[PDB]
UniProtKB/Swiss-Prot annotation, chains A, B:
Down-regulated in bone marrow cells in acute myeloid leukemia patients as compared with normal bone marrow cells. Component of the HBO1 complex composed of KAT7/HBO1, MEAF6, ING5, and one scaffold subunit: complexes containing BRPF scaffold (BRPF1, BRD1/BRPF2 or BRPF3) direct KAT7/HBO1 specificity towards H3K14ac, while complexes containing JADE scaffold (JADE1, JADE2 and JADE3) mediate acetylation of histone H4. Component of the MOZ/MORF complex composed at least of ING5, KAT6A, KAT6B, MEAF6 and one of BRPF1, BRD1/BRPF2 and BRPF3. Interacts with H3K4me3 and to a lesser extent with H3K4me2. Interacts with EP300 and p53/TP53. Interacts with INCA1. This is Inhibitor of growth protein 5. It is found in: Nucleus; Chromosome. It comes from the Eukaryota. Belongs to the ING family. The chain holds residues 1 to 105 of 240 of the full protein. It comes from Homo sapiens. The PHD-type zinc finger mediates the binding to H3K4me3. Component of the HBO1 complex, which specifically mediates acetylation of histone H3 at 'Lys-14' (H3K14ac) and, to a lower extent, acetylation of histone H4. Component of the MOZ/MORF complex which has a histone H3 acetyltransferase activity. Through chromatin acetylation it may regulate DNA replication and may function as a transcriptional coactivator. Inhibits cell growth, induces a delay in S-phase progression and enhances Fas-induced apoptosis in an INCA1-dependent manner.
């Protein structure tokens, strides 16, 4: 059913500029949350790359410093990732609600 | 419009370094904007292809992840087409004002 997928997708995309109020909200919350996730990813990239290059210049405590510090950033990034997945599923019901009504009014 | 603008560029054919700064800026922005506009429309076609071809096997959370990217790109084209209209309007109204000084002077 690629026909219906496409048809519904199109009809949806012509409705973006006035979605339901709670749906815009959810998309905005997901955007802000995606930012927190993108930033923590770029942050982890540094701590990783920095640790790799400057690896030999480190004692046993200075190694256990960076790892236990990176563990904190990975754990934090995961909270965001897990939250997004929940906020996404919640939003999917709203999108399915909207497309059904949208396409009922177009029939 | 275009014809006026074509004749304006024909006047400076050799001496394009004489051509006003506000106008030389705008003529580039129009060319840059057209690339960014033409890229986003292509990106949307690919993203929509991915979505049509794999929606059946995608979980609700993943269906929303895809929909985020397509929405945002679709918003960006809408934005880039409003930008192109208003930039060409401003560029054309500038060219007209510059034509009135050169060719259509009141003396
Ligand atoms: Na006069």
């Amino acid at each position: 059913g690629a026909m219906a997928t496409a048809m519904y997708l199109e009809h949806y995309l012509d409705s973006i500029e006035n979605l339901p109020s709670e749906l815009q909200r959810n998309f905005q919350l997901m955007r802000e949350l995606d930012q927190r996730t993108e930033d923590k990813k770029a942050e982890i990239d540094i701590l990783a790359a920095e640790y790799i290059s400057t690896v030999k210049t480190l004692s046993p405590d200075q190694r256990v410093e960076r790892l236990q510090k990176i563990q904190n950033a990975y754990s934090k990034c995961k909270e965001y990732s897990d939250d997004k997945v929940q906020l996404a599923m919640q939003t999917y019901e709203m999108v399915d609600k909207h497309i059904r009504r949208l396409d009922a009014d177009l029939a």
